[PDB]
Design an enzyme around this catalytic site. Structure first.
Site, PDB file in Angstrom:
ATOM      1  N   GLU E  59      38.803  53.478  22.706  1.00  0.00           N
ATOM      2  CA  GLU E  59      39.042  54.710  23.457  1.00  0.00           C
ATOM      3  C   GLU E  59      37.730  55.389  23.839  1.00  0.00           C
ATOM      4  O   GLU E  59      37.576  55.880  24.965  1.00  0.00           O
ATOM      5  CB  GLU E  59      39.928  55.645  22.626  1.00  0.00           C
ATOM      6  CG  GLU E  59      40.033  57.094  23.102  1.00  0.00           C
ATOM      7  CD  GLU E  59      39.160  58.048  22.299  1.00  0.00           C
ATOM      8  OE1 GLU E  59      39.316  58.104  21.062  1.00  0.00           O
ATOM      9  OE2 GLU E  59      38.314  58.737  22.908  1.00  0.00           O
ATOM     10  N   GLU E 136      30.411  62.688  15.309  1.00  0.00           N
ATOM     11  CA  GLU E 136      31.674  63.352  15.628  1.00  0.00           C
ATOM     12  C   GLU E 136      32.609  63.383  14.421  1.00  0.00           C
ATOM     13  O   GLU E 136      33.321  64.370  14.210  1.00  0.00           O
ATOM     14  CB  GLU E 136      32.331  62.645  16.819  1.00  0.00           C
ATOM     15  CG  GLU E 136      33.688  63.187  17.251  1.00  0.00           C
ATOM     16  CD  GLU E 136      33.977  62.942  18.709  1.00  0.00           C
ATOM     17  OE1 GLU E 136      33.241  62.152  19.335  1.00  0.00           O
ATOM     18  OE2 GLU E 136      34.933  63.554  19.232  1.00  0.00           O
TER      19      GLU E 136
END
Ligand code: HEM
Ligand code: HEM
Ligand code: HEM
Ligand code: HEM
Lengths: 292, 51, 71, 56, 445, 80, 380, 99, 109
Positions: E59, E136
């Site tokens: 993704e 992240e």
């Protein structure tokens, strides 16, 4: 106020407007702490008497028939049929605020005067915003046609976010650069972004990139149109401010009518106008407005 | 009383009819089992004989 | 009546009080007391008094009528 | 469904059915347990008690 | 007109199957935007302990490298057309979304055909994106409701493929090479597990001609005839409690296994979940709010927020409530939440269920208002439900639900069940699990 | 981070109808609940026996004595 | 360094309940009766401690043990007559406490009032159940009459009265039963009074005026402990006047014979706090109706939380509700006189009319009196 | 005659002698305590001053002289536009609970 | 609506004492002897309460009243020998509670 100031954008947007305007638009969107405990119901009643009235009111309806809405509006809106208390004309202030926050992410934004919404300079200024990167078009991307992001990322390697934002009100507007940086490289980020807008102001532009900015503005206006609350907000603001509804195809014709020399003129107007800067974070390497 | 009489409270009372009636039979059968009534325990065929 | 500090929110009321040792223990006990007892009994003797004379009339009626009926 | 699942679904999940099962099993436990305890007591002494010498 | 005639007048979704089995669906309406996205049935499920972060990595990675348009030429083309992209990855769906003008439609579907098949995977981008994914994932610890939902999925489905995160752990991110990612791409990105959702502004024959030109012959036949297989995941009622007493606000979720997608009772468990409702401290309703848990919470100042969720997967769901509360009222919020849950489950009223049915009808049409979330509904409904259920059939499923029906199937899916409990923060005044179970089943009924 | 937390192997404690990961727990949920509530009810019937019988012993001790029952029967007036 | 009365926990609850409890400053001498009932219960407990040390419980020598206490035990007459007249002091303090509770708007302290009437039932039960224990003719026949009037219920009545008798009549097991019950019951009355004080201290005390007293608060010490000492000294004045000057005046003189089942007193009469109970039981011609009127007469002042139809709390600002309250206590005095009188025409019609009027005041006329107060003061 | 009987009832009630008007002698229920939260500040302050002075006067077991008694024509019904609003809001809340 | 266990003060006492008391999860069978002492003290109070319904204290008939408890009244032998062996159990639980207090160092309370 605590929930809306958990987000770091809204705080310096409010203090940005406080430093960018003199009296009218410099009043904050959220209530400050000196008035908390002193808001009286008589002042609430005086403000809703002097500013909720019919000649400034626009009532729009999606999925509701026009004769039914005409009947409901005439059966409950005979009260308060004046023009209202006139708002003050906003004048530009200038100067900085620069304040310390306590995080490594420093948010600093430098704006100047742009035209009111409904003007050809403002139609140039929104396409200059979409030339210089109005937001993340790509989720988790690099935004590799925004000239601000290219000319900052050619000199900086730390994580950042450089955008340009436009906010045009009924009298005066703001255009500027919003940079979120780390506290060490923020001077190089802000000076490289300002030198990029200097390159736009001297005119280092590509007409295919201007056409891509025009298509970005047309597509972003269609993103604003395509949701029904956004469409209701669009015709509510159009019937409120302008009082007439242009078609979205007519908006696309105006954005296609905006050409390159208006972008050059608006970039020269932004780089030659008086600026205002709002900053927040560890401020040891944040540059000043005289240093720009 | 006047705030407790209504259609919603009648529907809630109708919803609470079978479990409160079954709790009433729980209390009646437990009272019968605690006191050992001679009229009632002589009808159950497992305790039919003399106890 | 939770505690002794967070009970009421009253305002602009001033209370002066003297010492137990800078004042008399029986301050005008007769001349301001017997009119006060007379005023309190004047206020409540018309409400507390005629049921008790109904009680005394029923008591004398029952005693003299039982002694009449037991002849 | 297995052996305890149907009796959980029809007489154990509601507390009123649980208490009715407890009371009905209490009455049956009274009679069956008193009969079994007196049976094992008279088996542990048949002729010593007053029953089975009551012929006199 | 009326409501049933208006939702009849909402246009249908023609769904059609290509020569390789890929499913194409569109919803033509009046607006000039166009929201073409590919939904793939891959997610955190159909991953082992190995290649666990492969769905989140792909993704993140499907925009950066391409065989035909290498480098950032995808970004240059999509900003020449001026479009916007999105890529959300869940436990059972990953997707790629482009919102655009409708005159850029062969460019949009050509960019999607170069994203989902001809994505190149350069190892410098693997190392750079591994560093960005680690940064992240370090930033994702502030996302506290995501931490509590991931803890709830870890403690609710332990030993199953639903225990793992969508992102994958930090000991599994660092060993993800290129050949494991292209094995994941060759296994779980197969064409009949992929739909092509469009929403408005399109024509379906134009989309099927463009899907014949571009998105035909992706991959249909497996490598060694090794098909992936969905398994019924075990729900284990458990308790995890991450105790951080210096942290300010306690996020605690309580969830029971719900029936999932393909079982038809998501409408009645959602109307119970919408009677219970949601609250945040910025809502200006106050004491006079309709949901009595929120009314009690703002009456005695219990919590900052609570959100009641029906997260569904294929035959297995988590339905429950997650609350952001203080350190001193978790026992109060747990007791009043179970009291409101089983006051609903014992004494449901017709006014309560018509309030919930009205708020569900408004919530479904407000969800399916916008083009991007109606494409989210088209892709999720085509992967899960098989067909896509129109809202007239959703209205017909809503209008059959009454309080008696809600009471017994609440007794099926709520009463005396062992829940999964997650908590991040000061979780001292959470009750222990036997007090959660004694506060579930009622002393009267 | 939060994704490195996994619940460990509970195979030594869990039941044999829950121990396989390819099956759902809702099939054996009624079986485990109807076993443990059978354990609870079979405890509670003996608790009700201990709360009924001891209370009956105390109530019959609060009742009349056997000496009082022997003396309360009157002398038999007989045929003459 | 620290305060002991807010640091030490027994001293913390003693300081919170007794020292600086927030109490209203305007309470009268009628508010002293709760602490007078506490110290009267403590003096009943300590005189029963020093009375049961020489008391033998069996019907052959219970009265001989009572006369051995009154004659041969040094200062035993003071303990026994102080216990009997302290039971009389306990019941006149209880009657003035419940008259204050009916008067000054304190129906609305609901759990306090419900555990109060449970306490009042236990106090009346232990008063009769200790009045049996001297074992006189009047005590034995009063035990027989009061327990025999509990046998009016069908199907549970004769099981209940052989359960409470231990035989066909009152005997040795009945007297030892009543002595064990008379030991155990005032300690659970004292624990009920402790949790009655806890249910009071949840919401504080109240004023005579029926207002919220939170604006004006004084500490309980030393403003109310010296009023407690003054009330204790006047209560000990009336109690010691009762024991040292008129010992058998409030008691019955017919109790001071040995108990004999072969004869009956010419009129059977229980004690002076049970006289209105005996008159209410004698008013109904049906015996089950008499025992239901007994239970409803003790329990009907617990319905006074549910019989507050007026928007003003106390009866200080209610002038004809005051008229109905004083005619209620007039009906109570007439009930006491009627229960003291024997069963003759025409005391029965006076008791019937006074019990009907007392139930009409406590049930019917005082809620419509509160309705006509709030109609005459223009509330609605 | 009805106003004279109401003035005689006002004199016989006793709180006109003691220093209170009609709305201080209300039972503090949840509706009356909601109206206690809903008075303005000056009316709240002299209401609690009148309750504190009434508690001082019934502590001293005496009343004010007749020149400073609260007359029936000097009575103001200050709590009634707040208490009627609280009563009708509670009435519509119980009607919505019945609905 | 409100929480009854933390709202009602009679329920607040039992909630702070026996329902929501902060207790350590460590504690063994020796820590159960305090509640065992309380329960066996309650059954000694109930047992002596039902034993004093036939007991007569005098220098002649105390042993006659004790044997009237033992064989003449219905099942008073169980109450009398339960009272004696429960005084023995009272001192068993008291000596083991005192030994628990010496055993685990709770002199600091
Ligand atoms: C015989 C034992 C009783 C004791 C020891 C007792 C104790 C007390 C105490 C200490 C107070 C607070 C007064 C003060 O300290 O200033 C009080 C007040 C109160 N009691 Fe009792 N009480 C008893 C009986 C009852 C009964 C039977 C009732 C029910 C009718 C009752 C209802 C009340 C009420 C409503 C109050 C609050 C109003 C007031 O303070 O007068 N009490 N009691
Ligand atoms: C737990 C504390 C108490 C103990 C140990 C106790 C013990 C006794 C004893 C041994 C007697 C028999 C001696 C006698 O003939 O006077 C007796 C009699 C009596 N007690 Fe108590 N008592 C207690 C509390 C009370 C209370 C609280 C009351 C008031 C309700 C009360 C009322 C009476 C009465 C009326 C008699 C009969 C007095 C007579 O006629 O001689 N006792 N008590
Ligand atoms: C009169 C009989 C007694 C009763 C009813 C009683 C009751 C209790 C109870 C209910 C507890 C709490 C449960 C627990 O933590 O174990 C407890 C704990 C305790 N008791 Fe007692 N107790 C008694 C005798 C004693 C004695 C004689 C001592 C002194 C040696 C004592 C000292 C303690 C201590 C130090 C603790 C807390 C530490 C611990 O439990 O290990 N108790 N008691
Ligand atoms: C307040 C409640 C109690 C009452 C009314 C009570 C009363 C009595 C009575 C009447 C007897 C003589 C009858 C008999 O057993 O032969 C007795 C015996 C006895 N009691 Fe208690 N008792 C009480 C509590 C206790 C407690 C807590 C203990 C333990 C310390 C205890 C220890 C004993 C012992 C050792 C005997 C002698 C047992 C025997 O040899 O018969 N009692 N009690």
């Amino acid at each position: 106020k605590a929930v809306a100031f958990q987000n770091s954008q809204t705080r310096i947007i409010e203090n940005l407007h406080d430093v960018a305007y003199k009296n009218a638009l410099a009043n904050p969107l959220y209530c400050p702490d000196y008035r908390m405990g002193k808001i009286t119901s008589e002042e609430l009643h005086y403000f809703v008497q002097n500013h909720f009235t019919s000649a400034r009111m626009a009532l729009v309806g999606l999925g509701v028939s026009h004769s039914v809405l005409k009947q409901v509006a005439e059966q409950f809106l005979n009260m308060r049929g004046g023009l209202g208390l006139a708002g003050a004309k906003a004048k530009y202030r200038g100067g900085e605020i620069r304040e310390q926050n306590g995080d490594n992410l420093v948010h600093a934004a430098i704006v100047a005067e742009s035209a009111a919404i409904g003007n050809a300079e403002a139609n140039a200024f929104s396409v200059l915003q979409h030339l210089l990167g109005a937001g993340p078009h790509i989720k988790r991307g690099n935004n590799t046609t925004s000239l601000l992001s290219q000319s900052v990322a050619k000199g900086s390697h730390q994580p950042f976010d450089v955008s340009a934002f436009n906010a045009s009100y009924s009298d005066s507007g703001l255009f500027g650069i919003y940079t979120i940086s780390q506290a060490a490289a923020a001077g190089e980020v802000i000076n490289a972004a300002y030198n990029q807008v200097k390159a736009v102001a001297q005119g280092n532009l590509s007409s295919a990139d201007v056409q891509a900015a025009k298509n970005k503005l047309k597509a972003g206006y269609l993103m604003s149109v395509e949701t029904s609350e956004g469409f209701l907000s669009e015709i509510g603001s159009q019937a409120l401010a302008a009082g007439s509804y242009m078609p979205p195809s007519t908006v696309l014709q105006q954005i296609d009518s905006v050409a390159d020399a208006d972008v050059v003129k608006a970039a020269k107007k932004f780089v030659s106008g008086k600026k205002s800067m709002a900053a927040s974070g560890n401020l040891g390497h944040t540059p000043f407005l005289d240093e720009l | 009383l006047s705030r407790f009489l209504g259609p919603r409270y009648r529907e809630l009372a109708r919803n609470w009819i079978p479990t409160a009636g079954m709790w009433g039979t729980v209390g009646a059968v437990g009272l019968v089992w605690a006191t050992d009534w001679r009229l009632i325990l002589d009808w159950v065929p497992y305790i039919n004989g003399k106890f | 009546g939770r505690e002794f500090g967070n009970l009421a929110r009253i305002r602009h009321v001033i209370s002066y009080s003297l010492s137990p040792f800078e004042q008399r223990a029986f301050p005008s006990y007769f001349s301001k007391g017997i009119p006060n007892v007379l005023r309190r009994t004047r206020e409540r003797i018309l409400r507390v008094a005629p049921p008790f004379v109904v009680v005394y009339l029923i008591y004398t009626w029952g005693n003299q009528e039982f002694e009449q009926s037991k002849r | 469904p297995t052996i305890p699942s149907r009796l959980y679904s029809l007489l154990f999940r509601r507390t009123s059915t649980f208490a009715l099962t407890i009371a009905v099993g209490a009455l049956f436990f009274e009679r069956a347990f008193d009969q079994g305890a007196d049976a094992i007591y008279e088996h542990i002494n048949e002729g010593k008690l007053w029953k089975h010498i009551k012929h006199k | 007109a009326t409501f049933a005639q208006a939702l009849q007048s909402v246009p249908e979704t023609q769904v059609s199957i290509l020569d390789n089995g890929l499913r194409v669906a569109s919803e033509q309406s009046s607006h000039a935007t166009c929201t073409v996205g590919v939904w793939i049935d891959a997610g955190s499920r159909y991953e082992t302990e190995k290649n666990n972060g492969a769905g989140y990595f792909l993704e993140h990675l499907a925009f950066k490298g391409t065989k035909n348009r290498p480098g950032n030429a995808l970004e240059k083309e999509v900003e020449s057309i001026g479009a916007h992209l999105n890529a959300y990855s869940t436990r059972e769906h990953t997707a790629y979304l482009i919102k655009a003008l409708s005159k850029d439609l062969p460019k949009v579907v050509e960019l999607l055909a170069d994203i989902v098949q001809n994505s190149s995977l350069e190892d410098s981008q693997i190392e750079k994106e591994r560093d960005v994914i680690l940064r992240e994932m370090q930033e994702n610890d502030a996302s506290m409701q995501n931490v509590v939902f991931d803890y709830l999925h870890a403690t609710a489905f332990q030993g199953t493929p639903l225990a793992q995160a969508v992102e994958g752990p930090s000991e599994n991110v660092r060993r993800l090479s290129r050949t494991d990612l292209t094995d994941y791409l060759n296994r779980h990105y197969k064409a009949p597990r992929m739909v092509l959702a469009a929403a408005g502004g399109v024509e379906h024959q134009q989309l099927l001609d463009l899907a014949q030109k571009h998105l035909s012959s992706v991959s249909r036949v497996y490598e060694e005839d090794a098909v992936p297989g969905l398994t019924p995941c075990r729900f284990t009622g458990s308790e995890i409690r991450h105790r951080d007493d210096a942290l300010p606000l306690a996020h605690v979720a309580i969830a029971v296994e719900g029936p999932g997608w393909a079982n038809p009772d998501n409408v009645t468990l959602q109307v119970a979940n919408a009677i219970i409702g949601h609250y945040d401290c910025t809502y200006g309703g106050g004491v006079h709010l309709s949901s009595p848990l929120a009314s009690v919470a703002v009456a005695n100042k219990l919590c900052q927020s609570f959100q009641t969720f029906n997260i569904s997967y294929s035959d297995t769901g988590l339905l429950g409530a997650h609350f952001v509360c203080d350190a001193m009222s978790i026992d109060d919020m747990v007791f009043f939440l179970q009291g409101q849950w089983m006051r609903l489950c014992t004494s449901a009223t017709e006014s309560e269920v018509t309030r919930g049915k009205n708020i569900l009808r408004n919530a479904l049409v407000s969800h399916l208002d916008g083009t991007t979330p109606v494409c989210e509904d088209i892709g999720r409904s085509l992967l899960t439900y098989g067909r896509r259920i129109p809202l007239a059939e959703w209205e017909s499923r809503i209008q059959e639900v009454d309080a008696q029906m809600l009471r017994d199937i609440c007794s099926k899916y709520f009463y005396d069940q062992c829940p999964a409990v997650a908590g991040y923060g000061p979780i001292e005044q959470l009750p222990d699990y036997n007090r959660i179970r004694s506060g579930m089943f009622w002393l009267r009924f | 981070s939060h994704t490195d937390v996994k619940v460990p192997d509970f195979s030594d404690y869990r039941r044999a109808e829950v121990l396989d990961s390819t099956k759902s727990s809702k099939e054996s949920s009624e079986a485990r609940k109807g076993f443990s509530y059978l354990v609870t009810a079979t405890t509670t019937v003996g608790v009700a026996y201990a709360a009924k019988n001891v209370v009956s012993q105390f109530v019959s001790s609060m009742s009349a004595s056997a000496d009082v029952l022997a003396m309360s029967k009157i002398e038999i007036k007989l045929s003459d | 360094m620290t305060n002991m009365r807010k640091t030490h926990p027994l001293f913390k609850i003693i300081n919170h309940s007794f020292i600086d409890l927030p109490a209203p400053s305007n309470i009268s001498s009628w508010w002293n009766f709760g602490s007078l009932l506490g110290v009267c219960l403590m003096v009943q407990i300590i005189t029963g401690l020093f009375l049961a040390m020489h008391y033998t419980s069996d019907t052959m020598t219970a009265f001989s043990s009572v006369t051995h206490i009154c004659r041969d035990v040094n200062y035993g007459w003071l303990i026994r007559y102080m216990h009997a007249n302290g039971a009389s002091m306990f019941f006149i303090c209880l009657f003035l406490h419940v008259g204050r509770g009916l008067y000054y708007g304190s129906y609305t302290f609901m759990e306090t009032w419900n555990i109060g009437v449970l306490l009042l039932f236990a106090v009346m039960a232990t008063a009769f159940m200790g009045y049996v224990l001297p074992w006189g003719q009047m005590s034995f026949w009063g035990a027989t009459v009061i327990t025999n009037l509990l046998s009016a219920i069908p199907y549970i009545g004769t099981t209940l009265v052989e359960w409470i008798w231990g035989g066909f009549s009152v005997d040795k097991a009945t007297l030892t039963r009543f002595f064990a019950f008379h030991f155990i019951l005032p300690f659970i009355i004292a624990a009920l009074a402790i949790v009655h004080l806890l249910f009071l201290h949840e919401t504080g005390s109240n004023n005579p005026t029926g207002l919220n007293s939170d604006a004006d608060k004084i500490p309980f010490h030393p403003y109310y402990t010296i009023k407690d000492i003054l009330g204790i000294l006047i209560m000990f004045l009336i109690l010691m006047t009762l024991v040292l000057f008129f010992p058998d005046m409030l008691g019955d003189p017919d109790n001071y014979m040995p108990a004999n089942p072969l004869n009956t007193p010419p009129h059977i009469k229980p004690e002076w706090y049970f006289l209105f109970a005996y008159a209410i039981l004698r008013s109904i011609p049906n015996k089950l109706g008499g025992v239901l009127a007994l239970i409803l007469s003790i329990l009907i002042l617990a319905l006074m939380p549910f019989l507050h139809t007026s928007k003003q709390r106390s009866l200080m600002f209610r002038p004809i509700t005051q008229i109905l309250y004083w005619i209620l206590v007039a009906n109570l005095l007439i009930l006491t006189w009627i229960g003291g009188q024997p069963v003759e025409h025409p005391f029965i019609i006076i008791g019937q009319l006074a019990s009907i009027s007392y139930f009409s005041i406590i049930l019917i006329l005082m809620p419509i009196s509160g309705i006509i107060e709030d109609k005459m003061l223009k509330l609605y | 005659w009805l106003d004279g009987f109401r003035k005689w009832y006002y004199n016989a009630a006793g709180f006109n002698k003691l220093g209170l008007m009609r709305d201080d002698t209300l039972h503090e229920t949840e509706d009356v305590k909601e109206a206690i939260r809903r008075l303005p500040e000056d009316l709240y302050n002299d209401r609690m001053f009148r309750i504190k002075r009434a508690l001082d006067l019934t502590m001293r077991h005496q009343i004010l002289p007749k020149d400073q008694w609260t007359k029936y024509e000097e009575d103001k019904f200050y709590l009634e536009p707040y208490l009627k609003e609280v009563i009708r809001e509670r009435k519509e809340r119980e009607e919505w609970a019945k609905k």
